[PDB]
C-alpha cells in the first residue's frame, strides 16, 4: 500500500554518459523504483535537464521482429515519430531504462532486436544518453562483458519498522496486529523472507483467516512449510478434489523453475495443455497474477511459492509411461536436484531442497491427501538418504554445512530421519547467532553418541546485555535445554570456548551442568570470554575433576583477591590430577605471586607450566627462582615466554640450573635478556652435574658474543641435546658454532637456525662440520640467502660423505637442472637422508613440544 513503497524509493533514488545498474533479490521492488523515477521525470519533479525518457522492457521486446530503433521506441507512441529525429537530436536530454534483463548506430536503420539492444548497451547508438538497468544477481555476468565502466547500486526493500507498519495497516486492530507480528518474528528464517511485500501479504492473510476462525496459530508459524501448506489448502473450493489441477500447477511451476523463466505468455500456458478455464481458479485464488500493463502476461505470486510447488511436484506420485509424452520436459531428477554442481549453477534450488525435506513428514501428507485427494510417493524417505554421501564425508563438516543439515533436519520434524544421519558424527564446531540456531542444535544433536570434540562460540545479541526479562527468559530456557549434551554424552573428551559474549546466568547454568559426575572431560580451554567473572567461576567449577588433566585460561584480567583464592585452592586440593596449566594476560602484585609460588611447592602432580603474556616485572621471576633452589621442588618443564625479562635475573637462573635435580626443560622465547644473561647461563651450564636437556632461545636479541659463549659452553661434555635459535642471528659467529660442532665432545642431536640472516660465503663451515660430526641428526635452515650459491656449495660438499644427518630443511627452487642433478646425486649416494626442499613456510616452530 502507498506511503511505504514511496518511503523506500525516496531514499533509494538518491544513491544514484552514465551507466547505472540496479540489482537485488526478487520482490524487493526495482520496477517500482524505475517507474517512480520516470513519473518524477514526467511530473517535472526531477531536474528540468531530463526532457525525454523511453521505456524498454525485455518482457515484451523478446518477441518483436527486426525493425529500426526509431520505430521500436515509437511503437507505443505513434504521434511522436514525427518528433523522433528532433528528440534524438538532443541525446544529452534523453533517459533510457531497461527493465528485467534476466527475463530476456543509426536509429533509423532496421536491425534485429538483440543487435539493437547490444549496441545500445554498448553505447554504439545515442552514446551520450543515460541508461538504467534492472536485473537479478544471476544475470549480472553479461553486463560486465557488455557495459563500459558502469556503477552498481543495490536495493534492500522493507525493514522491521515497515513490516510492523504493514501488519498494523492490514490487521487494523492493534492487539491482533501485534500478536501476529510477534508470532511471525519468533521465527528468524521466516522473518528474513518477510522483506518482500508479497510474503508479508501471505502471512497476514493466513494468520488473520485463522484468527477469525478461532484457531491456534502457534503451530502454523513453527516452520515455513506448515504456513505455506495451510495457505495453499485455504485457497480452493471444498469438495472439488481438483487432483488434475494440482498436478498441472505443480508441473508448470517445476518447468518454470528449471528453465529460469519468471513470466509466461498465453502461448506457453497453451503449450502445456493448461485449459484457460482453470485460470479463473488460479487467478481468483491469488496463485497467478495477471499483468495489467502488457496484456497477455502472467506470473506467480512470489518466488517462494513457486519453489514450494516445485517440491510438491517431486514428492507427487509419478505415473507409468509418463516418459512417452509428446514433449521433452526440462525436468531433472532427485539426485540431480540434490547435487552440488546444480546448486552452484542454479542457486534457486537450495530452497526447494528445504521444502522437500519439510514435505517428508507423514501428517502433512495425510492432511494434503484428505483436503485434495492426491496420492503421495512413499520413497522420498529413501531417496533423500540415497544422497547420504553428501553427509558421509568422513571428515568434520564445516560450520555452514552443519547449519544447512541441521536446518533441513529441523524442517523434517521427524526424529527417525535425524537419527540415521547424526549417528556417525565425531567432531563438531558451532557458531550461534540467534535463538533459532540454538533451538535447531538442541533438537538435533541430542541423539549423538560417538561425539568426541566440540568447539563453541556465541555471537553478540543472543544474550541480552546485563541489567526484556521475558525475551531473556526464553533464551535462558533454550540454553538450559541445549546444555544437556555435556551431561548425557559420556564419550565427549575435549571442549573449547572462545570469543563469546555470555552473561552470568548462562555461565552459571553451563558450570552447573559441567560439575556433574556423568561428564568425563580431559581437556579444556577458555579464550577471550566476557564478562570477567567467567574465569573465576570456571576455576571454581573445575576443582576435583578426577579426569581433568589439562587446562588453559587467557584474556585480559586483573587479580581480584577472590580469583587469587580460587587459583591457589585449585592446586592446594588433594583430589587434584592436573598435568599442564597455562595462564595469559594476568596482572598481579608481587605479594600475590609470592603466595601462589608458595602454594606450588605442595603440588605433586603438575609437570608443565606456561606463563605467556603475563607480567612478572622480574620480581616474580626472582621469587620463583629463589623458590626453586630448594631441594624438594617437583616441576620439570618451565616456560616464561614474554614476561618482561632482562639480564638481572639470569644469575638466579644459573643458580637453579647448577643446584636443581628435577628441571629438564626450559624456554625463554621473546625476551631480550642479552649477551650478559647468555654469559651467566653459560657459566651455569659448565658445571658437571647439569641435567638440563633442552633449551630454547628464540628471538632473544643475542649477538656474536653470545654465540661465542654458547660455543665455549658446548665445547665441554655437557648434557644438552636440543637447541633452538631463530630470528636472532649468528652469521658472523657461525664459524664459531661450526668449530664447536667439530669438537668430539659435542652431543647435540638437533639444531634450528630458522631465519638467521646467513650469507652464502659461510656454507663452507657448515659443510665441513656436517662431514665431520658423528652425532647430529637434524638441522633446520630457512629464510637464508644461500638459496642458489649456498645450495650449490652445500650439495657439492655433502656429496663426499654419508653423515648421520637424517632430516635437513632448506628452501630451494626445483626449476634448475644443475641443482636437480646435484640433489639426485646426493640422494643416490645417501638414500637415508631426507631433504626438505620447501622451507618457505613463514610459520616458526612453536614451543608447544618443548
Amino acid at each position: 500500500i502507498d506511503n511505504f513503497h514511496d518511503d523506500v524509493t525516496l531514499r533509494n533514488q538518491r544513491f544514484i554518459p552514465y551507466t547505472v545498474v540496479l540489482h537485488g533479490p526478487a520482490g524487493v521492488g526495482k520496477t517500482t523504483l524505475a517507474k517512480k523515477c520516470m513519473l518524477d521525470w514526467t511530473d517535472c519533479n526531477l531536474s528540468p535537464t531530463l526532457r525525454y525518457a523511453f521505456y524498454l522492457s525485455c518482457k515484451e521486446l523478446s518477441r518483436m521482429g527486426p525493425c529500426s530503433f526509431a520505430e521500436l521506441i515509437s511503437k507505443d507512441w505513434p504521434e511522436l515519430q514525427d518528433d523522433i529525429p528532433s528528440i534524438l537530436a538532443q541525446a544529452q536530454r534523453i533517459l533510457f531504462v531497461v527493465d528485467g534483463l534476466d527475463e530476456l548506430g543509426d536509429w533509423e536503420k532496421k536491425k534485429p532486436v538483440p543487435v539493437l539492444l547490444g549496441s545500445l548497451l554498448k553505447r554504439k547508438m545515442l552514446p551520450r544518453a543515460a541508461l538504467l538497468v534492472t536485473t537479478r544477481p544471476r544475470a549480472l555476468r553479461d553486463l560486465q562483458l557488455l557495459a563500459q565502466q558502469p556503477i552498481y547500486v543495490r536495493v534492500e526493500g522493507f525493514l522491521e519498522e515497515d513490516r510492523r507498519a504493514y501488519f498494523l495497516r492490514h490487521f487494523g486492530d492493534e492487539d491482533q496486529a501485534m500478536r501476529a507480528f510477534e508470532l511471525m518474528r519468533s521465527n528468524a528464517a521466516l522473518f528474513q523472507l518477510g522483506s518482500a511485500p508479497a510474503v508479508c501479504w501471505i502471512v497476514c492473510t493466513t494468520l488473520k483467516l485463522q484468527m477469525e476462525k478461532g484457531e491456534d496459530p502457534v503451530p502454523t508459524c513453527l516452520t515455513r512449510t506448515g504456513l505455506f501448506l495451510r495457505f495453499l489448502c485455504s485457497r480452493f473450493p471444498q469438495g472439488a478434489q481438483l487432483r488434475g489441477a494440482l498436478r498441472t500447477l505443480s508441473l508448470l511451476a517445476a518447468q518454470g523453475l528449471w528453465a529460469q523463466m519468471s513470466v509466461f505468455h498465453r502461448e506457453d500456458l497453451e503449450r502445456l495443455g493448461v485449459q484457460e478455464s482453470d485460470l479463473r481458479l488460479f487467478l481468483d485464488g491469488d496463485i497467478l497474477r495477471q499483468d495489467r500493463v502488457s496484456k497477455g502476461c502472467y506470473s506467480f505470486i512470489h518466488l517462494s511459492f513457486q519453489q514450494f510447488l516445485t517440491a510438491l511436484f517431486y514428492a507427487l506420485e509419478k505415473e507409468e509411461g509418463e516418459d512417452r509424452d509428446g514433449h521433452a520436459w526440462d525436468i531433472g531428477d532427485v539426485q540431480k536436484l540434490l547435487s552440488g554442481e546444480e546448486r552452484l549453477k542454479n542457486p534457486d534450488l537450495i530452497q526447494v531442497g528445504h521444502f522437500l525435506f519439510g514435505l517428508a513428514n507423514e501428517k502433512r501428507a495425510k492432511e494434503l491427501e484428505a483436503t485434495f485427494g492426491c496420492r503421495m510417493s512413499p520413497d522420498i524417505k529413501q531417496e533423500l538418504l540415497q544422497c547420504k554421501a553428501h553427509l558421509h564425508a568422513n571428515k568434520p563438516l564445516s560450520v555452514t554445512d552443519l547449519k544447512e543439515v541441521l536446518g533441513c533436519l529441523y524442517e523434517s520434524q521427524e526424529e527417525e530421519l535425524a537419527k540415521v544421519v547424526v549417528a556417525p558424527f565425531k567432531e563438531i564446531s558451532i557458531h550461534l547467532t540467534n535463538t533459532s540456531e540454538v533451538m535447531h542444535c538442541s533438537f538435533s544433536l541430542k541423539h549423538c553418541q560417538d561425539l568426541q570434540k566440540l568447539s563453541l562460540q556465541v555471537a553478540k545479541g543472543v544474550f541480552l546485555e546485563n541489567y526484556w526479562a521475558r525475551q531473556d527468559l526464553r533464551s535462558l530456557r533454550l540454553w538450559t535445554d541445549f546444555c544437556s549434551l555435556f551431561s548425557s554424552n559420556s564419550n565427549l573428551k575435549f571442549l573449547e570456548v572462545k570469543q563469546s559474549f555470555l552473561s552470568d546466568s548462562s555461565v552459571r547454568i553451563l558450570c552447573d551442568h559441567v560439575t556433574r559426575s556423568t561428564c568425563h572431560l580431559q581437556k579444556v580451554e577458555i579464550k577471550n570470554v566476557t564478562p570477567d567473572t567467567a574465569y573465576r567461576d570456571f576455576c571454581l567449577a573445575f576443582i576435583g575433576k578426577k579426569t581433568l588433566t589439562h587446562l588453559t585460561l587467557a584474556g585480559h584480567i586483573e587479580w581480584e583477591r577472590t580469583m587469587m583464592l580460587m587459583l591457589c585452592d585449585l592446586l592446594r586440593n588433594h583430589k587434584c590430577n592436573l598435568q599442564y596449566l597455562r595462564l595469559g594476560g594476568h596482572c598481579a602484585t608481587p605479594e600475590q605471586w609470592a603466595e601462589f609460588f608458595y602454594v606450588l611447592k605442595a603440588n605433586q602432580s603438575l609437570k608443565h607450566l606456561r606463563l605467556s603474556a603475563n607480567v612478572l616485572l622480574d620480581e616474580g621471576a626472582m621469587l620463583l627462582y629463589k623458590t626453586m633452589t630448594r631441594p624438594k621442588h617437583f616441576l620439570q618443564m618451565l616456560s616464561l615466554e614474554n614476561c618482561r625479562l632482562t639480564e638481572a635475573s639470569c644469575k638466579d637462573l644459573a643458580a637453579v640450573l647448577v643446584v636443581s635435580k628435577k628441571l629438564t626443560h626450559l624456554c625463554l622465547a621473546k625476551n631480550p635478556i642479552g649477551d650478559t644473561g647468555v654469559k651467566f647461563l653459560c657459566e651455569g651450564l659448565s658445571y658437571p652435574d647439569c641435567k638440563l636437556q633442552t633449551l630454547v632461545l628464540q628471538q632473544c636479541s643475542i649477538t656474536k658474543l653470545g654465540c661465542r659463549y654458547l660455543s665455549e659452553a658446548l665445547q665441554e661434555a655437557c648434557s644438552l641435546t636440543n637447541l633452538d635459535l631463530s630470528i636472532n642471528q649468528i652469521a658472523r659467529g657461525l664459524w664459531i658454532l661450526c668449530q664447536a660442532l667439530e669438537n668430539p665432545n659435542c652431543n647435540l642431536k638437533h639444531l634450528r637456525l630458522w631465519s638467521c640472516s646467513l650469507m652464502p660465503f659461510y656454507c663452507q663451515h657448515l659443510g665441513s662440520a656436517l662431514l665431520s660430526n658423528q652425532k647430529l641428526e637434524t638441522l633446520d635452515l630457512g629464510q637464508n640467502h644461500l638459496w642458489k650459491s649456498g645450495i650449490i656449495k652445500l650439495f657439492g660438499v655433502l656429496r663426499q660423505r654419508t653423515g648421520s644427518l637424517k632430516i635437513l630443511r632448506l628452501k630451494t627452487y626445483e626449476t634448475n637442472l644443475e641443482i636437480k642433478k646435484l640433489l639426485e646425486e646426493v640422494k643416490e649416494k645417501n638414500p637415508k637422508l631426507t631433504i626438505d626442499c620447501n622451507a618457505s613456510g613463514a610459520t616458526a616452530p612453536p614451543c608447544c613440544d618443548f
Binding site: 552459571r508 547454568i509 560439575t515 567461576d537 571454581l540 576443582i543 583464592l565 585452592d569 603466595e595
Partner: protein, 106 residues
C-alpha cells in the same frame, strides 16, 4: 519470618568473618555434629568493623570452606567440591539468621 532472598557468595575476609555480595558481614555462631557424615553450621548477621584482610596462609586450616556460591535448584557449592543444602533462613527481632548442612558426597 521467612526470607525469599539468598546471598550469592561468601568470601572469607577474616577467619569467622564472611562478606556477602553486598559487603554485609555474616558471623558464624556454632557448629553442630550429629555423626561422622552430618555437619550443620549456623550463620548470623551482624555489623562489625573490618580489619586488614587475613591472607589464606594466615587463615590456616579450618572446617568451613573459603567461598560458597549459589547454584540453581537452591544448593550451595563450597570451595572443596562438596554441596551444602539450605535448611532455613528467617528473621527474628530484626536479626538475620541462616542454617546450612553438609550433604553426603555423591
Amino acid at each position: 519470618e521467612a526470607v525469599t532472598d539468598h546471598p550469592d557468595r561468601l568470601w572469607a575476609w577474616e577467619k569467622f568473618v564472611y562478606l556477602d555480595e553486598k559487603q554485609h558481614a555474616w558471623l558464624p555462631l556454632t557448629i553442630e555434629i550429629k555423626d561422622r557424615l552430618q555437619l550443620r553450621v549456623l550463620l548470623r548477621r551482624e555489623d562489625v568493623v573490618l580489619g586488614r584482610p587475613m591472607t589464606p596462609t594466615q587463615i590456616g586450616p579450618s572446617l568451613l570452606p573459603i567461598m560458597w556460591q549459589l547454584y540453581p535448584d537452591g544448593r550451595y557449592r563450597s570451595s572443596d567440591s562438596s554441596f551444602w543444602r539450605l535448611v532455613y533462613h528467617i528473621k527474628i527481632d530484626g536479626v538475620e539468621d541462616m542454617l546450612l548442612e553438609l550433604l553426603p558426597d555423591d
